[model samples]
Target: DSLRPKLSEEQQRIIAILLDAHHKTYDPTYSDFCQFRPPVRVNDGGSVTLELSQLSMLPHLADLVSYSIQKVIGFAKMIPGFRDLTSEDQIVLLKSSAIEVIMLRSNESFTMDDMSWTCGNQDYKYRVSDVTKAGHSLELIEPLIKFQVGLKKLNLHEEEHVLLMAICIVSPDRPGVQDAALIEAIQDRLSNTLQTYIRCRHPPPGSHLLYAKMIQKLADLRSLNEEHSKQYRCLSFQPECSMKLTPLVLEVFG
Candidate 1:
């Protein structure tokens, strides 16, 4: 009952071949991860698969990159008619259902601080917070700041860093009360260590990209947005909080 002419067998074959080639060549190695992995594939139904590598690679806001991935899953989970569908489809179609989640991880360490046994000026603030865990390990902080510092040094400051923070919802994992107190105790120590030595600090807006960076920097870190698995080494996690207090970033001097 259609009005238009149907495509010939030859035409259909050409289209199928084009599509097959595209699928095979368009994506690189991790497409296997997307096409096969468990949690990433959502119950082996292939309903949802996230592409976090691209977003992680660009150090800036990437709406198209993020949304296109969402659209891919939505298209794959297609349902016929308004009511007839599988039970699995029903679960996936729920308003709350989210098939894929994009996560940004870091692959490098922040290099703004001198690795002295004890940083003194920053030490007083740490003691005051009473979070000085006598035997716990320690690490450096905030990478975007170092990136910012490096950018400023090289004169590559752009309008993107602030936008990057706002768009990504970057934040630190919760530094528990004791840890929080400890981190705060030596605010002077930490901040100065960063500012004086590394020439960086917390974003002055919300949380820093520290956690994201640390996660990315881990040996196993992998991002779909980057060529090398460890390319995004500048994210970090600050103290986690229930509420977001300020906008992501503001003009530092102007």
Candidate 2:
């Protein structure tokens, strides 16, 4: 088979490890109370709609985010060299990239046909209105939905997506990192492993620029991260909204 010859032990090992961690992070089904609703811009694809009255959902959304944050923390600790960074560096790395990982993982839950996200049932669905009600504006939500669709269209294997998640976290450039070279060492290994997978699995035509395109998605995530933080900070300053935010949410995005 074309995939057999180039399959290095390191590539297989890293992907196997990430595959386990990914499973632990994502649950297949959950039950909830909220009613099901259609997404705002399914076929129209013209504009985002906001519901000012979803104000009551803010606390619920904040709580769900806090739970997912713990899962992200759990996932990072399992990465090969993640915990070896000094405790402070580990904290700094997670603080910066946790939400980005969550956004990427969300791809698993996104439904392309409906242009919405759902995990188990009706109550589990999320639409544009929920995002705006949570304090994020169209400026951020629009680009985010577009990013999700583009990534889904890439049709990457599950292993590739998990590898990308690890790559996103082991980054050395976060401002507070005290040891960039140390992080880079780990990153170098991950880079090689990911390249090996692409070479073995993706078709030549599609694989040609796949790596660069993946990097571009990460660049987009960086801009989205900035806007997300700005919006969170705005909500934190509001008396009505601040109390709903979990302490961990404020601490990480604080």
Candidate 3:
């Protein structure tokens, strides 16, 4: 069959290894609570009933972002060649692509139709509507919702997801990358593996188109990630949204 022919033994072996490690490294269902943890209640001397404050939740958002960044970086380090790169290159890759990784991870939390992120057993919700009301632009929301929808449609296997993560990390054009030739070679192999994997999984008549579209969607994910961060910066400045941006966040996204 065409599918069998398309799948090289090398691709199969690498995918098997990466997929096994990907499952161990990342938990799609694990929502970091630090991002959405509710604020504490304070009792005043007076008899006024004290309630949880939303503003107090802002600081923890920083913590949530920090946690996601570290998780992505850690996940990248698990990839076969990721550790071989120089520390400077590693940080550069992480800084450039961590948000995209976070975006991919966050698909777990998204409700496509609702355009909301639910966490903590759905007790907490962050809605696009709520964010828009806070003076952040709505531009990123539609692209993000669309991207998640497309990703679900693909029904990606664990191997495919891990390959995409690797591609994002070894992005050839990311600034400050040293040893460009080495990174490009790694990327070429990953791309070939990804294309072959898709072909084997989704047979022709449309397989070629699907592979091209998925690659574009990855680029779309990065653009949406950048816009989402811009929105975060904008919202963080609102009087009700005071919080210190962590150095990691500032460095990666400032």
Candidate 4:
């Protein structure tokens, strides 16, 4: 509060309300249960190739990714101010920021060691190198894992996680935004409230700096997400297999 004395009482109340609402908003759907559902059950001795060229596998991955993004959009809508934006602007934000939201929402999948992530049980563990081979660069994966592991180290509350996602969605730089300044103003309020909330809860001498660090990590996630989009072009198509992306997936990620 001392660090952000300018935050209005109404803004403080909004933060408190969002902190409480976060618990309700944080539920994971079946999609979060696994990274990518195989077209057939791989664990049940179901046949499907893990190779990237398997076009059959591509649609499943695309569906899961798009579903995760939709869930995040749903979660964002539950926040107090998010739905107040113009619907066009809202879609713009979601389309642009979906990958970052997915990354943050799926942080639980990433192991603390940064070596692997799991969708279900230990049998489903995926190595970081495997993700690199699919499309992501090691440079992106290394820092992305570092950020995920760092967030886990903090043991952030559900409220903190929701607020971080909130700030991310309200970013000013997303392409095709009609109200950049307005959106940025919303982001600034969330940022200030988060700083105060962290200081109030954490109270360690350097706890205030945690907000800045998390913002930096969000920027890193954006970089990694952009790289994924580039690699997805090649990975999404396979001449040998006939899997087609769903219409929803094409609109969001095609």
Candidate 3 structure quality by residue, lDDT tens digits, 1-254: 44444777887777877776666655556554634445332332222112112333345455566777877777787776777788888888888888888777666666765767665454355665433333345487667777877876766676777788778888878878987887888788888898877766764445567677768877897788778777777655554443445677767776
lDDT per residue as tens, model 1, 1-254: 21223444543443344334324322322223232211211112111111221112122112222332343334223311212333433333221111111221110111224421111233211221111121111121123233323433322111122112111211112212223333232332222222221123234313334434422332121122231112212211112210111122111000
In model 3, the clashing pairs are: none
Q: TM-score winner among the candidates?
A: 2
Ten residues in sequence with the least summed lDDT for candidate 4: 40-49
Clashes of 1: 32
* Top of the candidates by lDDT: 2
Clashing pairs in 4: none
Predicted candidate 4 versus true structure: per-residue lDDT over 33-130, tens digit per residue: 45554543222122124444333334455556666776777767766667778899989998888888878877866676545766555434556544
Question: Each candidate's TM vs. the true structure?
Answer: 0.17, 0.87, 0.78, 0.78
Candidate 3 has a TM-score of 0.78
Candidate 2, residues 1-254: lDDT per residue as tens digits?
A: 33434767876887888899988876756432232222232232232232333344566677767777888888888888888889898898888997898889889888897888887555567788667666677888999999999899888788889888888988999898999999989988887787777877787555547878887889999998998888778666666565767788889888
Clashes of each: 32, 0, 0, 0
On the 0 to 100 scale, the lDDT of residue 197 in model 4 is 71
Q: What local lDDT does model 2 show for residue 143?
A: 91
Model 1 TM:
0.17
